[PDB]
């Protein structure tokens, strides 16, 4: 038989197939059976709380209508346009905010059917989905973004989504994220939806991304070390250079404020504590309270007498002890924590 | 009866049905039922003075029409195909700045049509909706943001559109907004328009959105606070060390402008004094005052005898106990106020 | 019985109509007349930078034609479905000064489609556009704008087809519609903008709208702060003139805060090569801070020797300047806002 | 004859007309003649080195199947929607990066057509076109934009562009550029293309675009000028007041580099020196050399004998004359040059 | 001879008989594509991003027994490309593309053309946008290599073949530039053939090398960072007396070279490795901290005003003017010998 009737025959003019109507319409509902294979993965963003895809979408099930003899070729693969003419599931995204098929050069789908009736349907799509962070451990968080498979019209009783059993998550080879690790262990579940309209079938893979630290120590955790360390070196300066000893003072201080401003600039505006917000505030009140230190100082040795002149170099000299040591302790307590 | 016979018959060729025409064309207007499910609410823009929700939008009407008796089942669950075949409502979103529908991987619609001829139309939008800001308060404001669903060809006397009576208004669960609370209760009304064109239904839903405070207390107040508290050393440094009080005063002026022009960074460019504004301008306030009071200080005690260097001390020691004193007495003001 | 609408439109505008919408009403006549309105649900995204601004209207557009004049129902006039528009002849309207146009479409085409008895027709339709806003930025931010909107033929020309504004209410606001940095003057202006190309005469209509800019953000974010600087330049007057560290550190800080206030209020604005109004202020307090450096610059110079006559010198030097320096602002800050809320 | 019928019998079902075939198919290459109308003309970015511009398209050419005796009408003007059943050149933009049509509210164009089958195609459209820019002498440069209107899939045998005689490129009236200065000049010339695919014409126009000087004068050469004259003022300060004279030192030099790189953010990231960088350099150069004669100032009076006071004061009596002097003939030399 | 009209119904429409949903040869062997790519620009090379755009003709050449004429002496027939959707076609896509389109303006930017014995050119207009994964290790010193991906997504291996062109199979517009980057003459072509879960799929790659231009970086990263270090000696010349300049001088050289340092971070992604930029600003920045760490031991072992220890601390000053700049001198040498050789 010629290809051009046998598609006339199974899905065309004189076939009487209708894709109005689903596999075992009058029975139980049609199980379908989802993969994704993970072409890239990235665009994380924090701020706009999201992420991008670029997957091809796998869906398998069962039409009785589509099984053939004609052939003894045990699969069939099909011209994508015949898609149009067959029944197919309505899967959507629940959590999609951005989605598009692919189109050059020509539209990215697959088409293929088995002798008894079986289809798989490849889909090539971008989708960028919303995962909602917890920051408070920015910057050693790991965050789990999920994505939702789901059926928009056809309730429980019609359509059933199930992830595949043999390798449902498939990953393109060396693909990396510059900010995060992708671990190897997909979490599968079933989010089945309850809504005014009906239950509905809804299957869920969350990817863990564990936030790469060596970014943040160059960034972020060393230059606020310079600026602490920076702020020890008054402690050596004399105490009679009251100008050289608080520019000192006032300019780590700001630096050290600019530097913690900076960072929360790459972030959304959330109204809880971060890990990064600790860090910053215990650096400021270090940086700040070796200012306060020569305040005192400068305070007490207001009278130019021996004895008070003693009492001020006392403050110093131990401040070059302990301001050190104390920084060091609070490193150990942070470090440790996290 | 087969289902390809029944949608011929009902919709379809034999049927009959023009869509062109509304239910019952010559008698009263079509009421139509409308609830959303809030699948996403979200990107609330203070600059472009707008925010973003993925809905379902139900509408619910009865055409007589489409009133069946082939089967015994309540409901049909139909192909949303269909829906091209039937007459709807011309539902619009009058404050809509962008809008768009879901089409991966299929149209997200759902058709369903009961034996009485009622209709149940659910579809999924993204929409951006305009929410003109009132931030006199800000950042202690609270927002309010309205959805209005209109018809844009049909008058009062051919359609009418009404909210549900139970759960007009429903939201997905675990549903958080980052910078906002969105409150339980929503405001259901009228918006009525009336056009050159004539008069045309309207129904509007008001979110209350709650700014969180707490963002605003670690990146606004409490940094500005410090160059507050720093602007205050001054008072215990040597009044001979005119570089250094001066260093101090200025570069505290100066941190705290470049503060209060950062946090106007992110807002439009209202012409009106927000809450942020006076606190600022309070800050600057204590921060210049200081800086002042060590020019009063440095300018009366030019002569250096006892009776002018023990006034200009005394200026010191007050203003030691009045500064802080004044602005704990400022902040029982501003955070009792609002 | 009266005749089904399906067969109505049918021998109207359908299958057995014979109606050609390739074909103007009275094509071997005058010129279609063509009435416009507009309905402003929408008006913002003024952009100085990009130099245009953003509406969203419906456009109605009248006129006549014979060919769909009833007498089949004694209805004055019938609101048909939208997907009649595509049967129907209608004017080829278009936005000569648009960058950016599109129609809605969610959640059906937002169109309307009104016939009555003689044939006239009643056509609304919904857009978002975005218009080109030449600015004349010389009174910034003191200035006023005037933004139009052409509506114009693109293939018909004056002898087939002529638009005009309505008589009667042509350009209708949205209830409480307000803008943050502007104010929409409650007139606005209507003329022609008849166009004349190479490949013909072509009928144009325009609208003016007028923005007036609202001052109080500019007072608080502009010429408030570059008085603290000023007036913050002139405590050095009244520090010691032994104290140079200190009063050179207050001469130069505020310089420096002067020209980054100066050029952060030029990052907002397009790179026009014109003196505008914001540019004369930043200059003039720019100069009085500038000038306080050079004050002690003087006052350091003429007191090198520690003697009393030049120690003198350099002392009236400080105490006509904590005068004039605060005087001579005043006066500036009389003439410039005379000038500019005045002429 | 009605029109309905005339257009049938000349493109429609009864014309036998095939669009798919060229004017003279076996004869000799269709002769196009186009000319645009420049309706705006703008967005000229240096960091995305492309500009924008909204045309009007016109494209004559002969068909001689679209001849008509029918009616005495030296022209008839035809609905848009002709466009599609006539033939027509495939003139793409080769140096285009986006391009779209108009479609609010009907399709923005043009078709006329003559007694003796003469074709006006007029399209508004809007393009983005790349601009390759030398910076070299920037901002006193002048770029050359050009626009390439080039056959797609006709060879020279088949398909010929050629500019009109008379006035191929019109401007709208008081058209202006905030940035630039368009000259009333434009270049017209041929691009004719060579690929493995064959010869194809090509025709292009070349816009010259003179950057506007004033804003540069203002907020670059002026405020560099400041920094400068500022960095002199050290002069006549006291050589005994290191910080003061060291802190406008810095303070300059510091203002400069910030001035230089906030001017070169605006620009893309080309490797060759242009007339800025010289500028920014020589300023610079002026501002460190103050600084450093501070330092020999500093260094050949550390003791404090009239010998070595003397010849430091000869240092600092020489720099106020010999420092402007340079810098005026510095920018003698540099405007000059330019 | 046959009018034009006919011979296209003839051929590939109504009367013809075609299917345009079976591929040349179906019961037979794969077909074999040929592909080459011009490319008419080349840009928009982004590190934050970690892609690159191009726009292209993209040809593909393949035979079509079905296609095949003699009605006319003409060894090829350039047809319109409205035909195109009536004959069958390779369902090429771009496996490492984030975006991609045609082009319409002023008409599909597409050529067909056929030959007497069924062979088919088939030239299609695409803007893309491919992702290219970047190793910054060496930035702005280093050189990167892009890829772009030309795949089926549909046929198997056993129905479908793409193959580069054997003579010129990538073309470069003349006078093509780009404003960050050198692009090298030598492209470097490929196999990447696919094995998925649905089968075994055709790839061929093509691989440009990118070498970063290196001028732009000497003048607004690298000779500025020599300021600030040359600017941090001065303090070396003045007084030991005068804290207040040797502190100011030190505190705004560091701070200076950490917003300088910062400054640069901002263009790129936020990657855990160490660049070669990261070494330069971290030396510099040694180099400058080191300075005022000196004035701190001069201050104060100079405390007691005795001349002993006056000494010791301008013996340190003395030092520090010979030994900043010949280690800093030193550093350099290492430095550029290293990355560049
Ligand atoms: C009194 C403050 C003075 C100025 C002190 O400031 C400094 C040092 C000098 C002064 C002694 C510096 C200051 C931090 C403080 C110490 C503060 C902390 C260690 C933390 O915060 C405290 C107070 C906070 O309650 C306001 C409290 O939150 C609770 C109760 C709240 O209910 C009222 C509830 O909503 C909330 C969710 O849970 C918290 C647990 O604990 C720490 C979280 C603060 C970090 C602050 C900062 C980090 O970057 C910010 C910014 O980028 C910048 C420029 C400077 C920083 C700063 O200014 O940091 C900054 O704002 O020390
Ligand atoms: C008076 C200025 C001098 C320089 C004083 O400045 C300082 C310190 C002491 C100086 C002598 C600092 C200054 C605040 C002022 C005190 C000002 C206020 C408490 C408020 O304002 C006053 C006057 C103002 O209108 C003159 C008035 O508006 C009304 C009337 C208008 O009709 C004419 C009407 O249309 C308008 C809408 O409502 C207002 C209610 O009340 C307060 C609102 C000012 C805030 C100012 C600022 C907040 O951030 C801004 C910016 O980010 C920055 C860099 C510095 C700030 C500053 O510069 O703050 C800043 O610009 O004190
Ligand atoms: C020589 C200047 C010295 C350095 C003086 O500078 C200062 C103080 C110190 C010196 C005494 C500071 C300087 C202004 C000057 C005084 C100058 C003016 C009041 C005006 O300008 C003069 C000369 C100018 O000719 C270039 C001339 O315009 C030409 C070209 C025009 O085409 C556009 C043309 O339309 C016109 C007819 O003709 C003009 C008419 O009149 C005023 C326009 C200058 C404003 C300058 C600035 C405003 O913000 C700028 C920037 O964001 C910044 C950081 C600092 C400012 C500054 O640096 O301001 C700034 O650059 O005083
Ligand atoms: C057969 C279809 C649908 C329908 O159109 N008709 C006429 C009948 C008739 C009798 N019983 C049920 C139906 C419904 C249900 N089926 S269906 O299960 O194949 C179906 C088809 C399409 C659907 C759908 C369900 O959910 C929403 O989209
Ligand atoms: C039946 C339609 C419409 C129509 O086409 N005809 C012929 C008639 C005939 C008699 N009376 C009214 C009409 C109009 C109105 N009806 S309708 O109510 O179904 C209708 C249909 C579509 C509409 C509309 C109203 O307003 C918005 O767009
Ligand atoms: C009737 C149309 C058009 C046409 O097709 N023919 C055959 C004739 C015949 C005789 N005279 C004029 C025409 C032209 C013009 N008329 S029209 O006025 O209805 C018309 C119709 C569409 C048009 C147009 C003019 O210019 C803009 O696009
Ligand atoms: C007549 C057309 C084209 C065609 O389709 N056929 C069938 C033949 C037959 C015999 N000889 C030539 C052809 C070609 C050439 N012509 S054409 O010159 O009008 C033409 C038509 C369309 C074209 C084209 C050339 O190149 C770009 O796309
Ligand atoms: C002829 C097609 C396709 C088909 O539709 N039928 C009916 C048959 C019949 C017998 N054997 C194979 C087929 C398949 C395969 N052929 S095809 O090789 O031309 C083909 C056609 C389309 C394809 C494809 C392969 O890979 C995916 O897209
Ligand atoms: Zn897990
Ligand atoms: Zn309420
Ligand atoms: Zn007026
Ligand atoms: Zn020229
Ligand atoms: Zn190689």
């Known amino acids: 038989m010629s290809p051009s009737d ?33 072409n890239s993965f990235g665009s994380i963003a924090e701020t706009t709380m999201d992420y991008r895809v670029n997957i091809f979408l796998r ?5 009785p209508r589509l099984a053939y003899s004609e052939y003894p070729d045990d699969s069939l693969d099909l011209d994508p346009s015949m898609l149009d003419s067959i029944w197919k599931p309505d899967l959507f995204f629940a959590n999609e905010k951005g989605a598009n098929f692919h189109e050059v050069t020509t539209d990215n789908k697959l088409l293929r059917i088995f002798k008894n009736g079986n289809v798989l349907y490849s889909i090539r799509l971008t989708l960028t989905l919303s995962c909602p962070m917890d ?9 789990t973004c999920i994505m939702q498979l789901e059926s928009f019209g056809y309730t429980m009783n019609d359509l ?38 009906g239950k509905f079938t809804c299957i869920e893979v969350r990817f863990h991304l564990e936030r790469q630290m060596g970014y943040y120590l160059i960034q972020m955790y060393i230059p606020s070390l310079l600026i602490v360390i920076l702020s020890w070196v008054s402690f050596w300066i004399n105490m009679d250079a009251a100008p050289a000893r608080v520019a000192l003072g006032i300019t780590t201080v700001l630096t050290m404020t600019t530097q913690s401003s900076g960072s929360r600039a790459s972030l959304p505006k959330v109204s809880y504590v971060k890990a990064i917000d600790i860090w910053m505030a215990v650096c400021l009140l270090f940086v700040f309270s ?14 130019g007498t021996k004895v008070f ?12 002890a302990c301001f050190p040591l104390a920084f060091l302790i609070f490193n150990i307590f942070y470090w440790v924590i996290y």
Chains 1, 2, 4 share one sequence.
């Open 6 to 38: 046998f598609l006339d025959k199974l899905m065309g003019r004189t076939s009487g197939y209708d894709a109005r109507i689903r596999p075992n319409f009058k029975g139980p509902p049609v199980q379908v059976t989802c993969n994704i294979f993970i």
């Open 59 to 63: 869906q398998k099930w069962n039409d």
């Open 135 to 143: 920051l408070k451990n920015f910057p050693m968080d790991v965050q």
């Open 160 to 197: 059933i989504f199930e992830w595949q059993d043999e390798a449902p998550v498939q990953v393109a080879e060396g693909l990396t994220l510059p900010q995060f690790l992708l671990k190897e262990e997909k979490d599968l579940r079933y989010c089945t939806k309850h809504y005014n309209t």
């Open 290 to 303: 070796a200012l306060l230190e020569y305040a005192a100082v400068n305070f007490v040795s207001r009278a």
């Open 309 to 320: 002149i003693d009492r001020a170099k006392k403050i110093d000299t131990i401040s070059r």
